[PDB]
Amino acid sequence: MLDKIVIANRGEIALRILRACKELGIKTVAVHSSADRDLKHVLLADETVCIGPAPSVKSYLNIPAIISAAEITGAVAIHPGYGFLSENANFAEQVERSGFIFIGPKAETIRLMGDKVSAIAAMKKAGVPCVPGSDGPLGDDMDKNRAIAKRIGYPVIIKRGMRVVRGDAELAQSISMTRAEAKMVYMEKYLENPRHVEIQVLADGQGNAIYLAERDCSMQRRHQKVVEEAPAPGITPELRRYIGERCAKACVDIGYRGAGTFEFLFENGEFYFIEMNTRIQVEHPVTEMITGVDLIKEQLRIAAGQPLSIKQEEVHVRGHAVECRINAEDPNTFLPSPGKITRFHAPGGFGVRWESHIYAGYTVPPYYDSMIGKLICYGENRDVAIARMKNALQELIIDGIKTNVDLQIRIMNDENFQHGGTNIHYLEKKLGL
Amino acid sequence: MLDKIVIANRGEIALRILRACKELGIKTVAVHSSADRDLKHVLLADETVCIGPAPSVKSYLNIPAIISAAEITGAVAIHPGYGFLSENANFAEQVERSGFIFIGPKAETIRLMGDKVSAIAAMKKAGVPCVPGSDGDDMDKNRAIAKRIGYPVIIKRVVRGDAELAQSISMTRAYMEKYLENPRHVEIQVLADGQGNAIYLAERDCSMQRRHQKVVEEAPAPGITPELRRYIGERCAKACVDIGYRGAGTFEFLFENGEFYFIEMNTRIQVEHPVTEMITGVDLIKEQLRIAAGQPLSIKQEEVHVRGHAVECRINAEDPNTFLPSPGKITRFHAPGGFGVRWESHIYAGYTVPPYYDSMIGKLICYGENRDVAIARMKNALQELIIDGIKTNVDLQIRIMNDENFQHGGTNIHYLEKKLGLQE
């Protein structure tokens, strides 16, 4: 197993990673910004290295600084975490060219899924369901244009008030009208009220891949996830098998290695590929609760060249989990609201999981994002899970800053949310956004 | 479910019960002493009631006061919790008679099991493995029993063979019983509804003790096979029936050489119960409430599956080198977090641990696929735990987790005292 690793990220995730390393007997190097001196994981790592000033561009984004840190400490691999350089193909290539192991997929692969086109194209071949439409451009002949629309199913759009065709009568006009807007067009199937269901995978690089059920991330605000849960309500074992197996196959055909996620749009029992995150996600714990798999350790094994420990048959969905992201932000602008936390109290109990680096007297800096933690409650059913969350949030205390707690509470209390199956627009809708 | 309930307890176990109420939609009533005003669960309760000055004698033990509290609030039931009036027949008797619901078994049952003798007797009726003995000047017969018992034996002096028989008996003379030199402390968890249903929830090992007080607990118990698991469980479940047990309870046994010897039954929820919830996924507390509301047993034996392994380190405010209670003000606190980590405690930064009550302030529970994972989580977990302003057990717990012998599993009730050098 791996000797030492560099945790190339900060906050929450960093801490998550550290714990996982410790458990595995792996030495930790913590790279930090002068401003992240007081971070919890930093305080807990084995080695430490301040890579640069406060600003991300000069610290967390500084490849060179990062690489060298690895050279000096004599670290073998690097863990990108999520959101920084996690999906930056250079870094990846660079790390490897440098003599270190990149905890994630091949740069090649990253480049591939980096552009919709190739991604989609790759997806198509692999049998991954994508949004139907017109292969090439859309011509003059109304007979076949309309045959297309039948094929794909109204409503559809043709890619000024924006316009959605709901039937034949309108087809021709909207089509022409758009061509007129130049002085070369296409038709795409319309997804009015879809849900956001993403599939979780693991691949060893040696031919093995596995799906680990799904997650519903429909509760979003400004295209940013707020609540996440697993498994996805409404999803059947059969529907789960179908898209999971398609997903794994793809993985195989693409030489995927590590953890990855496939994000789909789900409407009327159908899936439509949106994108692949070629890294672990913030929402992973939701899945860990349900399968009992530790995504992070598994990621560490793969990197070491261990193949997949798990077989699909050993993967089992049990119970239900919900996650509430917790942020320090402006209730109106949604911007981070930096400051010193005067009082903190975490919630506890059965089925309660707290993932945060914050602490009492800890100062939230303005240079980064606003997320300060995540709360995951598990339960034998959805309902139990929701109930735990209700309480947990009630027990949670964070003074000295503006949070998001109130809204989460309000969401847990939502009629429809408790009913389940809301869509990607419900949230903004209920807020007035 | 029940509407409103009284939490006839405090600290840690009080907050665990509160949370279970909330989830169910049950209103809570918290009775506290003037010295537990600031308790966590107290701050979280629906309703509150001061029942007396600090000394438990006057507060937590003040029956009449407790009873009145349920009256004025309109409460329906009372949850005794653990270690107070929890195993008090009178209390149970008066509760019921005053028209309330006692969340526990029947007073009759509490007495019946509160007697070292009466119990054994009952246990022998149900057919529960008890410690073999004389069962009631001869050196001829007297030797044959011992054969039946198996050596070693003890006259209540230790005997290993016929030889030392006389000499030892003659010194004794100046009852014979089985001698368990190196046993483990294995207890079985049960749930019964009083409506004829009874289920066992595997076992736990609490061999790790000091002054006969549990320090670390785990589940399941290492070396314990399904076959054995079943044998004993079925046995304990059966007895629940004969005795008409209602509620949660535990049968504690001494384990040695593949054999179990009954010791006792705590007619109540135990401290260590969490270790079981993790391994079977059953909320022991909610069931309790359930049974008290007149519902039947929700689970079926076949539905009881043991998965993974769990460990529990009790956290106390004592001097680790003297074991002297350590009341004081916690000035810095940080709880551990993560996957498979469970923190159960009412303490909070700025909180004052009083001298009046017991020294335990929290429990730390870790889970894994393996016992190795759980121990490994424990270790990290303890590393993250921060409690400043008072003396704690931490460091000792850390030492235990690192004990080569603990990592191996199978230790006995004596290891700890030894390891520490307290046996002297």
> CA of B376, closest CA in chain A: separation in Å?
6
Write the burial class of residue B196 (CB in 10 Å: 0-12 exposed, 13-18 middle, 19+ buried): exposed
Using an 8 Å CB-CB cutoff, list chain B residues near A349: 16, 19, 342, 344
Asked if A345 and A328 count as a contact pair (C-beta separation under 8 A), the reply is: no
Please state the separation of Cα A386 from the chain's center in Å.
21
Q: Which two tokens stand for residue A293?
A: 């798999």
- Find, in chain A, the residue whose alpha carbon is nearest to that of B277: A350
| CA B209 – CA B181 distance, rounded (Å) | 16
Q: Catalytic positions of B, please?
A: 268
Residues A76 and A107 in one domain: no
Which residue, of B50, B68, B85, is where some domain finishes?
A: B85
Report the half-sphere exposure of B253 (CA within 13 A, side-chain side): 27
A204 and A254: one domain? yes
Contact flag A360-B349 (C-beta cutoff 8 Å):
yes
Nearest to B275 by CA among B361, B344, B376, B174: B344
**Nearest-10 Cα torsion for A360, A361, A367, A373:** 0
Q: Is there a contact between A342 and A419 (Cβ–Cβ < 8 Å)?
A: no
Smallest Cα distance from A183 to chain B, Å:
59
Cβ contact A292–B383 (<8 Å): no
Residue B384 in contact with partner chain A when CB distance is under 8 A: yes
Q: Which residues of A touch B332 (CB under 8 A)?
A: 360
Whole-angstrom Cα distance, residue B170 to residue A302? 71
Q: How far apart are CA A77 and CA B98, in angstroms?
A: 68
Q: Is A399 on the interface with B (CB under 8 A)?
A: no
- Torsion angle of C-alpha atoms B237, B238, B240, B246, degrees rounded to 10: 70
A353 with B337: Cβ contact below 8 A? yes
The verdict on A294 touching B (C-beta cutoff 8 Å) is yes
Rounded Cα distance between A90 and A94, Å, is: 6
Q: Assign A140 to helix, strand or coil.
A: coil
Backbone angles phi, psi at A301, to 5 degrees: -75, -45
Task: Give the method used.
Answer: X-ray
Query: Which of A345, A355, A356 is the closest to B348 by Cβ?
Result: A345
Identity of the residue in A343, A355, A387 whose CB atom sits nearest the CB atom of B23? A387
User: Is A346 in Cβ contact with B337 (below 8 Å)?
Assistant: yes
Beta carbons of B379 and B366 less than 8 angstroms apart: no
What residue of A is the nearest CA neighbor of B21?
A391
- Three-state SS string across B57-101, please? CCCCCCHHHHHHHHHHHCCCEEECCCCCCCCCHHHHHHHHHCCCE
CATH number (domain holding residue A72): 3.40.50.20
Same-domain status, B104 and B201: yes
* Same-domain check for residues A145 and A259: no
Catalytic residue among A10, A195, A279, A388: A279
Across the beta sheet with B153-155, the strand order is B158-159, B153-155, B176-178
Which of B22, B337, B341 has its CB closest to that of A391? B22
Q: Which of A41, A316, A350 to mutate to test the interface with B (most CBs of B within 10 A)?
A: A350
**Residue B336 in contact with partner chain A when CB distance is under 8 A:** no
Q: Let me know the angle formed at the C-alpha of B36 by B32 and B40, rounded to the nearest 5 degrees.
A: 95
Cβ distance of A288 and B334 shorter than 8 Å: no
Q: What is the CATH number of the domain that holds A182?
A: 3.30.1490.20
Touching check for A317 and chain B: CB below 8 Å? no
Which residues of B fall in the annotated binding site for Mg(2+)? Answer: 252, 264, 266
With CA atoms as reference, the chain B residue closest to A356 would be B337
Annotated binding site of B for hydrogencarbonate: 214, 268, 271, 314
- Both A114 and A16 in one domain: the answer is no
Q: In what order do the strands lie in the sheet with A77-79?
A: A47-52, A27-33, A4-7, A77-79, A101-102
How many domains, in total, are found in chain B? 3
CB spacing of A355 vs B338 below 8 angstroms: yes
Q: How many CB pairs under 8 A join A and B?
A: 66
Give CA–CA dist B196/A364, Å, rounded.
57
- Same domain (yes/no): B169, B210: no
Instruction: Note which residues in 26-85 of chain B have CB less than 8 A from chain A.
Output: 44
Q: In what order do the strands lie in the sheet with A371-379?
A: A270-277, A257-267, A195-204, A209-216, A227-230, A320-327, A371-379, A352-356
Which of these three, A159, A190, A221, is where a domain ends? Answer: A190
Buried b (16+ CB within 10 A) or exposed e, B63-78: bebbbebbeebebbbb
Are residues A335 and A261 part of one domain?
yes
Domain that holds residue A195: 86-130+191-433
Find chain A residues with C-beta within 8 A of B344's C-beta.
348-349
Do A227 and A78 fall into the same domain?
no
Judged by CB atoms closer than 8 Å, whether chains meet at A391 and B23 is answered as yes
Q: Do B349 and A343 touch (CB under 8 A)?
A: yes
Q: Within A156-204, where are the H helices?
A: 168-180
The two counts, helices (H) then strands (E), for chain B are 15, 20
Nearest-neighbour CA in chain B from A206: distance (Å): 25
Is B241 in the same domain as B351?
yes
Question: Alpha-carbon distance A33 to A50, whole Å?
Answer: 5
Whole-angstrom distance, CA of residue B75 vs CA of residue B71: 6
**CATH code of the domain covering residue A383:** 3.30.470.20
Structural domain ending residue among the three candidates A142, A159, A190: A190
Compute the distance between CA of residue B323 and CA of residue B316 in angstroms, rounded to an integer: 9
For residues A42 and A46, what is the distance between their CA atoms, to the nearest angstrom?
A: 9
Cβ(A215)–Cβ(A229) below 8 Å: yes
CB contact under 8 A, A349 and B342: yes
A221 labelled catalytic: no
Same domain, B297 and B378: yes
End-to-end CA distance of chain A: 49
Examine the domain organization and report whether B331 and B397 are in the same domain: yes
DSSP string, B170-223: HHHH--EEE--SS-EEEEEEEEEESSS-EEEEEEEEEEEEETTEEEEEEES-TT
Instruction: Please judge whether A16 and B338 are an interchain contact, meaning their C-beta atoms are less than 8 angstroms apart.
Output: yes
Same domain, yes or no, for A31 and A158?
Answer: no
